[PDB]
Design a protein around this ligand. Structure first.
Ligand SMILES: COc1cc(C(=O)NC2CCN(C)CC2)ccc1Nc1cc2c(cn1)c(C)nn2-c1cc(Cl)cc(-c2ccccc2C(N)=O)c1
Length: 284
């Protein structure tokens, strides 16, 4: 079914002109949308109701919107309202004009140490806010680390995110870099996100995923067993941090707060801004 050229809500009663198709994710298709009065530009996820004909799936999306709406941080995707007409359910989000950290990784392979510091730093900051407000992301990947014209990392996609309700809650229900305890159904918590970060750091510094195999089932074996190695070519202080962040036992992975203070960040060069050049070539 045809998607409207102009998107109006009812709510805020603003008109959104559907512009260039940016891409797709699952059932969602994302278009660049411009505010018809203010000319301000946003990135609107478009989901058809036909995708959420089930009440079960319809929840997962209204769980996600619930959490995202409450968020407000320079390292999280700005949530800017949601609405629906009869055919589609729309979500209006912060435009990130430099794709994600994936497209960067694929085009760059291994990035330099001082870069990964900059990207980790920023990502871990937004992960902190998330944890401070009692949220777990649970599907942290390079495709979720969005970049804008300033090269700022801005965490997105909460389709597998939950918010903890009581003190020491352990979650059992239900992703890319899933932790061992997510697999063994032993019950997960805040420390699954640290594992994703440990992975991301690896993937960045090394140039390939740590549990990267051709077969899907093979991957799940690799993780459970704790089957990885950091190539000798990596800085010891960096491999060290990587190894802690990937520890088998959840209760020994570093806390979000303990990450920033770690030698890795505080030992070598850590630039405060990166040029757009980095999207294709190493910085000089
Ligand atoms: C303006 O900067 C952008 C350029 C491009 C780009 O280079 N597109 C090319 C893709 C291939 N086609 C053939 C030509 C155009 C994509 C997204 C941009 N910006 C952007 C995207 C955003 C957001 C904010 N800003 C938010 C918030 N969400 N998304 C978002 C969300 C989901 Cl679910 C999908 C996708 C998506 C768009 C394309 C490919 C892949 C994906 C993908 N699956 O991640 C994007």
């Amino acid at each position: 079914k045809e998607i409207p050229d102009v998107l109006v809500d009812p709510r805020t009663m603003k008109r959104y002109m559907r512009g260039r198709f940016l891409g797709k994710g699952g059932f969602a298709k994302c278009y660049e949308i411009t505010d018809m009065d203010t000319k301000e530009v946003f990135a609107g996820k478009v989901v058809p109701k036909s995708m959420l004909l089930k009440p079960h799936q319809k929840e997962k999306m209204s769980t996600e919107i619930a959490i995202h709406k409450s968020l407000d941080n320079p390292h999280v995707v700005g949530f800017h309202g949601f609405f629906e007409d009869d055919d589609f359910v729309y979500v209006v989000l912060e435009i990130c004009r430099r794709r994600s950290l994936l497209e960067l990784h694929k085009r760059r392979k291994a990035v330099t140490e001082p870069e990964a510091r900059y990207f980790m730093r920023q990502t871990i900051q937004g992960v902190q806010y998330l944890h401070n407000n009692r949220v777990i992301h649970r599907d942290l990947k390079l495709g979720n680390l969005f970049l804008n014209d300033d090269m700022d990392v801005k965490i997105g996609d909460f389709g597998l995110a939950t918010k903890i309700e009581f003190d020491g809650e352990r979650k059992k229900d239900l992703p890319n870099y899933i932790a061992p305890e997510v697999l063994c159904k032993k019950g997960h918590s805040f420390e699954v996100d640290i594992w994703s970060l440990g992975c991301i750091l690896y993937t960045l510094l090394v140039g390939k995923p740590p549990f990267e195999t051709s077969c899907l089932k093979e991957t799940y074996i690799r993780i459970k067993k704790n089957e990885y190695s950091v190539p000798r070519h990596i800085n010891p202080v960096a491999s060290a941090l990587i190894r802690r962040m990937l520890h088998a036992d959840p209760t020994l992975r570093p806390s979000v707060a303990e990450l920033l203070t770690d030698e890795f960040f505080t030992s070598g060069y850590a630039p405060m801004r990166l040029p757009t050049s980095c999207l294709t070539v190493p910085p000089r």
